[PDB]
């Protein structure tokens, strides 16, 4: 099951107010008009890759979808968060809670905090140790799938957990419709209005329309010719061609000679027909100081 | 909690304590002669009181006195590459006072630990709790140390009997990142009343300048702090005293 992710998934890269100005940034969004997977909520919770993020959407009428667990192992082996709302309190903890055999909510405790008609979009992520809760509730008159429309997704609360997530599993309520778009380090033409709601966005590395859109810094491009980037035939492999040298070089000889010359008569040992690895040099930890002036101290091998 | 503390973390599991909802004065830190090295290229030491910061994290750990230049942008070293990486664009100020008499004991302060083996370089400000045995040779290592099997997380020994080059030294990254998050740790300066239609030297949350201050009708969202023009210069602000 596939879906055309029409316009959803735009949020605030930052929450600094801007007016009638188009800001371009590199950030993690899912592409517009892209392929996203379609799920149902009958009798499905595989552990999808949250490589850098996904966009969640819910068609809800009785508050069935209620939480998430994100992480790298998600089995209390790593720090993993659990979300429950018991009709009065918001509870987001990564503490060592007792998870069920199949993780559900009914119908290393370092982070020391202890306490259709609706579309709900939630993006829980980590960028540089910030945990951004992204939330939006939107009314609609549509039943078939996710609606077509623009919705800025704003931060609410930033909490100190700073967690590795590379693959995620959704949380069910036992006695979840969602979408998975792989985010990429892509550059995005973002539009702010005078009231401060992000009204539109462009994934501008996608198609020629969008490439012109973010090279011309405009959502409307005139008819014409525009250079956008550079095309280079990428190398498919690496070829190394060196002389057929067969003798290990006496670098060890000028390290382990029986005598060394003074500064009054130091020697010029000139070297040809050799192989120099320098890996034994770097593997030797004897170096008291290594001030390597022309060439890299590490990058020489 | 970060200076007069009873317990300091190590470089493998250094505490990343968000410091927020408090007043950061720094004046007692100036008056303290306890610091020996006060190095940072990001901010200045002495002219810091007038600035109000985004959010400050105190990275608490212990490394050697010769290793104090390793906590720097672009420095390459053993601990710098296996325990704690500093980005090239690092903003913030690292403080290293002398720990001649604090983080040491007669038998050896044996609770400070550090990684020495890794097959990859570290990301900035990462948290690696990897407890696998590093593989030195090509033989598979079934938890059995010995030949081609050594464990990376190495410890120190701190005794007052040890030499001053091996004596424990305290280095702490009070990481002063000025990032997007709302300012909460301002200087110990008294506030003044607000003036309109008259240009005045303003210092709003550390940002200095001159200009006129009139009320605005824009609905800044909660957690929305500044309005920047095309020049990213502050065009509008929300008063943090009155909304």
């Amino acid at each position, epitope marked *: 099951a596939y879906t055309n992710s029409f316009t959803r998934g735009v949020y605030y890269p930052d929450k600094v107010f801007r007016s009638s100005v188009l800001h371009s940034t590199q950030d993690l969004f899912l592409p517009f008009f892209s392929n996203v997977t379609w799920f149902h909520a009958i009798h499905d919770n595989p552990v999808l890759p949250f490589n850098d993020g996904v966009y969640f959407a819910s068609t809800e009428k009785s508050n069935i979808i209620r939480g998430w667990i994100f992480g790298t192992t998600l089995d209390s082996k790593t720090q993993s968060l659990l979300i429950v709302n018991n009709a009065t309190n918001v509870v987001i903890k990564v503490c060592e809670f007792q998870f069920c055999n199949d993780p559900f909510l009914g119908v290393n405790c370092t982070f020391e905090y202890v306490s259709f008609k609706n579309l709900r979009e939630f993006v829980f992520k980590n960028i540089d140790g910030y945990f951004k809760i992204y939330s939006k509730h939107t009314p609609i008159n549509l039943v078939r799938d996710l609606p077509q429309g623009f919705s800025a997704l704003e931060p609410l609360v930033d909490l100190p957990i700073g967690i590795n997530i590379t693959r995620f599993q959704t949380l069910l309520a036992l006695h979840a419709a969602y979408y998975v778009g792989y985010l990429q380090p892509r550059t995005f033409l973002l539009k702010y209005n005078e009231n401060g709601t992000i009204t539109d966005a462009v994934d501008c590395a996608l198609d020629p329309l969008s490439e012109t859109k973010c090279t011309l810094k405009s959502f409307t491009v005139e008819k014409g010719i525009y250079q956008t980037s550079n095309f280079r035939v990428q190398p498919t492999e690496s070829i190394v061609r060196f002389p057929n040298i067969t003798n290990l070089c006496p670098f060890g000889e000028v390290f382990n000679a029986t005598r060394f010359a003074s500064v009054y008569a130091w020697n010029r040992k000139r070297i040809s027909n050799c192989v120099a690895d320098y890996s034994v040099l770097y*593997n030797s*930890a004897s170096f008291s100081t290594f001030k390597c002036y022309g060439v890299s101290p590490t990058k020489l091998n | 909690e970060v200076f007069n503390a009873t317990r300091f973390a190590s470089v493998y599991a250094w505490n990343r304590k968000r410091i927020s909802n408090c007043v950061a004065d720094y004046s007692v830190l100036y008056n303290s002669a306890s610091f020996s090295t006060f190095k940072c290229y990001g901010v200045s030491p002495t002219k810091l009181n007038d600035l109000c910061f985004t959010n400050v994290y105190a990275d608490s750990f212990v490394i050697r006195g010769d290793e104090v230049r390793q906590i720097a942008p672009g420095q390459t070293g053993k601990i710098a590459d296996y325990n704690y990486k500093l980005p090239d664009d690092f903003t913030g100020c690292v403080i290293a006072w002398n720990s001649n008499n604090l983080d040491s004991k007669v038998g050896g302060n044996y609770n400070y630990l550090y990684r*020495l083996f890794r097959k990859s370089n570290l990301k900035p400000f990462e948290r690696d709790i990897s407890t696998e045995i590093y593989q030195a040779g090509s033989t598979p290592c079934n938890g*059995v*140390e010995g*030949f081609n*099997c050594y*464990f990376p997380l*190495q*410890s120190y020994g701190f005794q007052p009997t040890n030499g001053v080059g091996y004596q424990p030294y305290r280095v702490v990254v009070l990481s002063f990142e000025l990032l997007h998050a709302p300012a909460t740790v301002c200087g110990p300066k008294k506030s003044t009343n607000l003036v309109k239609n008259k240009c005045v030297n303003f210092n709003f949350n550390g940002l200095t300048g001159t200009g006129v201050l009139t009320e605005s009708n824009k609905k800044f969202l909660p957690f929305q702090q500044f309005g920047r023009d095309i020049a990213d210069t502050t065009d509008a602000v929300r008063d943090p005293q009155t909304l």
Partner: antibody
Framework: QVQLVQSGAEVKKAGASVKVSCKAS????????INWVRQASGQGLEWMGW????????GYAQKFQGRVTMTRNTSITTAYMELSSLRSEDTAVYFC????????????????????WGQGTTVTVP | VLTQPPSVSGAPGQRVTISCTGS?????????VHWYHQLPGTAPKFLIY???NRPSGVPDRFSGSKSGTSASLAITRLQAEDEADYYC???????????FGGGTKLTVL
């Protein structure tokens, strides 16, 4: 600068257990792996296994599997070889080893037990 | 012991390649063989590890060579005073971590 203290001469009944100590403290012990090696009276030496003071590694050998466990008290880093439900083959002088290579050197060379411990004997006679 | 002149009566200078027979895991792969020596009159102070790798006061006359199924260390300059106890240890891989044999002894007549 390696300092080494152990238990003394003792006699114990068959089937008993010992809470033996192999106590290293007071220097840069971290570069050294405090392993375990024995020798019988008049025989060649034999290596029981390793104990790694470098933050918590465990791994045994075959000749005393099922009879011995090990733990380390990382505060002052006391080494153990817990002879529990003792048998006939442990009546000898029991010593520790010390992995002599420097661990901040990346090359994993041989263990050099340059300094050797005091004494340990569980003689099982009636 | 592994196949050497296992326990002979030897004066200090006997040019005896006191060997240490190892398999392909030991003679070829385990080239970091070290020689313990529980010395008569003190706790083992071998002062001879990594074959010819020497501490202070130790001569290069203990030559370490791997030849087929045979290790080597020897001495020179025949004298009377070097009655001592020798041991060879190899990384035996599938066996315990590093294992000796039977207890090589050097003694004079």
């Amino acid at each position: 600068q390696v300092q080494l203290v152990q238990s003394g001469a003792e006699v114990k009944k068959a089937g008993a257990s010992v809470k033996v100590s192999c106590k290293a403290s007071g220097y840069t012990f971290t570069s050294y792996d405090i392993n375990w090696v024995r020798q019988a009276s008049g025989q060649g030496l034999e290596w029981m296994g390793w104990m790694n003071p470098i933050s918590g590694n465990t791994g045994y050998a075959q000749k005393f599997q099922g009879r011995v466990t090990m733990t380390r008290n990382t505060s002052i880093t006391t080494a153990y070889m817990e002879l529990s439900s003792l048998r006939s083959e442990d009546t000898a002088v029991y010593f520790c080893a010390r992995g002599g290579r420097y661990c901040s050197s990346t090359t994993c060379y041989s263990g050099v037990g340059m300094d050797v411990w005091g004494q340990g004997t569980t003689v099982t006679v009636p | 012991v592994l196949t050497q002149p296992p326990s002979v009566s030897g004066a200090p200078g006997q040019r005896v390649t006191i060997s240490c027979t190892g398999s392909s895991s030991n003679i070829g792969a385990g080239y970091d063989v070290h020689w313990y020596h529980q010395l008569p009159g003190t706790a083992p102070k071998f002062l001879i590890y990594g074959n010819s790798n020497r501490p202070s006061g130790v001569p290069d006359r203990f030559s370490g060579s791997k030849s087929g199924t045979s290790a080597s260390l020897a001495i020179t300059r025949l004298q009377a005073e070097d009655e001592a106890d020798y041991y060879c240890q190899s990384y035996d891989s599938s066996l315990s971590g590093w294992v000796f044999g039977g207890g090589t002894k050097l003694t004079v007549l």
